[PDB]
Amino acid sequence: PKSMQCKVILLDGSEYTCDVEKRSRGQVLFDKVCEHLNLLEKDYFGLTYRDAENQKNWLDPAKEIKKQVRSGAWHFSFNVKFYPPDPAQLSEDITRYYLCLQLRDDIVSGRLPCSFVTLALLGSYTVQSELGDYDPDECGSDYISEFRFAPNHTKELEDKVIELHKSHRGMTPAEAEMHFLENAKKLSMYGVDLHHAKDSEGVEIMLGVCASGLLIYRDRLRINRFAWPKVLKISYKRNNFYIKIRPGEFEQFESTIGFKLPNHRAAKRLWKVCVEHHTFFRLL
Numbered sequence: 001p002k003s004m005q006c007k008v009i010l011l012d013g014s015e016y017t018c019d020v021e022k023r024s025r026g027q028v029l030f031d032k033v034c035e036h037l038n039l040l041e042k043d044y045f046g047l048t049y050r051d052a053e054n055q056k057n058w059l060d061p062a063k064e065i066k067k068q069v070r071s072g073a074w075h076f077s078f079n080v081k082f083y084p085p086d087p088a089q090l091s092e093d094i095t096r097y098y099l100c101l102q103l104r105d106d107i108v109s110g111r112l113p114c115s116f117v118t119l120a121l122l123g124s125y126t127v128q129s130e131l132g133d134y135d136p137d138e139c140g141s142d143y144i145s146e147f148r149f150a151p152n153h154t155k156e157l158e159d160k161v162i163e164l165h166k167s168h169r170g171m172t173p174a175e176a177e178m179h180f181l182e183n184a185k186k187l188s189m190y191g192v193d194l195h196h197a198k199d200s201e202g203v204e205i206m207l208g209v210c211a212s213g214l215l216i217y218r219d220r221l222r223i224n225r226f227a228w229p230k231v232l233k234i235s236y237k238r239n240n241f242y243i244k245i246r247p248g249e250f251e252q253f254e255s256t257i258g259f260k261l262p263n264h265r266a267a268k269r270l271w272k273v274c275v276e277h278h279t280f281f282r283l284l
């Protein structure tokens with residue numbers, strides 16, 4: 001029974017290696033990674049892989065791995081797929097811990113924009129969880145942490161992390177991680193998956209997929225929002241993605257809204273993540 005070597009980048013930046021039978025479904029690999037991580041609340045998470053042009057796709061746990069990675073290497077990342085709108089309602093601390101690791105990379109990568117003060121507050125809770133109580137011995141007036149906190153580190157930001165870290169004396173790691181999450185969950189781009197597109201007039205927009213629905217960011221005009229319960233059908237055709245905005249009160253007809261994506265694969269990818277979010281965030 002022939003087995004393929006899998007390499008998975010974990011949210012701590014380390015590499016997990018395992019083997020699965022070459023005809024394995026994505027769930028087989030995901031179960032092995034989640035067991036390695038002691039993760040029970042697995043529904044929020046998934047595996048990604050970089051495609052024949054370094055774009056990230058979700059590995060579908062119900063489909064053969066080989067029919068997804070196709071000609072590419074069996075190399076994956078472990079990631080949050082569905083960002084819980086209220087992380088305090090997760091059953092296990094270790095789930096919150098992995099969500100913190102994902103958010104820390106969302107912040108350093110700049111996918112999750114963050115004010116100076118929130119960068120320093122989030123950083124202060126991470127230091128508290130990892131190192132425990134502030135120690136002056138591990139920090140002179142010239143201290144720079146090993147912790148990556150932000151897309152662009154400054155001495156001012158390092159100083160503000162230390163100032164806030166001093167305020168958290170006696171805080172336990174689960175407690176610090178919950179405070180991290182209480183702040184992060186409020187950020188306007190928390191759990192927003194952004195996709196480049198054009199409106200029906202060729203004007204560049206971003207479409208954001210998240211728990212609360214689909215976001216249109218036209219930038220120069222406004223930000224339109226479609227709560228999932230106002231969305232009846234999602235579809236793609238060629239390079240186009242369409243959303244049927246259910247007819248409101250006393251309106252005769254449903255309404256359909258169309259977008260142009262970079263290529264057909266980018267339309268299919270946006271359709272699949274919307275369908276998955278619609279399903280997941282209907283069951284809350």
Ligand SMILES: CC1(C)CN(c2ncccc2F)C[C@@H]1O
Pocket residue numbers: 194204205206217218219220
């Ligand atoms: C500053 C934003 C929130 C908006 N945005 C846009 N990018 C290109 C075209 C149009 C846009 F709206 C990037 C980011 O998501």
